[PDB]
Amino acid sequence: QESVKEFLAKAKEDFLKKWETPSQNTAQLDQFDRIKTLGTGSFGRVMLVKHKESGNHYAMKILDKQKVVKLKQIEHTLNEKRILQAVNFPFLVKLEFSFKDNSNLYMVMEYVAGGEMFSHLRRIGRFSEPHARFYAAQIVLTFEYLHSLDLIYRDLKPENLLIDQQGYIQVTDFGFAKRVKGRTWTLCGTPEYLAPEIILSKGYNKAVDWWALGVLIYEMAAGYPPFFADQPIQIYEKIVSGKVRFPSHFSSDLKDLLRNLLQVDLTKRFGNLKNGVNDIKNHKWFATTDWIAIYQRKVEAPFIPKFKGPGDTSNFDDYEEEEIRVSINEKCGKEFTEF
């Protein structure tokens, strides 16, 4: 318990060195080959790429300067990159390279071939409590680290957790990540995962991440989220309402834990109490979990997705291949000066 505190301490120091003095233009477009698109986003897409000098595969994130701009996501894009190049945690996707060009922003990360948890979750339906618990444990720890650096993640969902070769998770998409001492007020996240304080425009803190966990956990063990409907509006209504129904297969410990994460009253919510994280690590639901073991990647994973070979894309869905178009004249230069 003190070992943790001390860990965190050195870790904050490392982060700060990088937070105050970031990396810029460490690669070029040409140094890679575009293999396949792995996902599409709002302002960009993700592609499997291949580094010519080393023959290593990576996932390259590509953001359109112009769309980031019209969508007023400028600050958010700067944050994502600035933060990603500074963290280092076993369950965080590693940023290798970063660069930009006349029309785009690029973030090159390592490739995690197991695909999104979302695909498995959906295909299988739901996970057994022990299975989900395995995952939760990793996110608790990840949040423990992140929150320590005065960071809020803000975009927890199955779509964002990737599964590696060992069956361990990797958190991707820091598009909403923000370093903040104090409150923030941006309306952002994914409907089914938004805390009421966000929805209510109340000004929020890192406690929103904990409500998110609650949702994650419920979703994985039930196979469906606690609050769903066909139009966001309908969802917002159920979130703030305060009602939550659980499946009859939930263990009582589970129901207890989720009843605490899904606390509308920020003043009662687990994780945002004096004792923070400990209120969670100590719960009966996780009585079996050896935090240290998880951290160390010593625990045997419930499911390992088998990799056919390096560069294999079998675990991702297919998307139409647009082609990377690179302008002759620079787009939004001053806006992305620090990238």
Binding site: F118, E159, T186, E192, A229
Partner: peptide
């Protein structure tokens, strides 16, 4: 069943993140 309700819902796929 709720599970069935979920399945026939419109939000069974990948959810996009909101902003403003």
């Amino acid at each position: 069943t709720t599970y069935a309700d979920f399945i026939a819902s419109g939000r069974t796929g990948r959810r996009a993140s909101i902003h403003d």
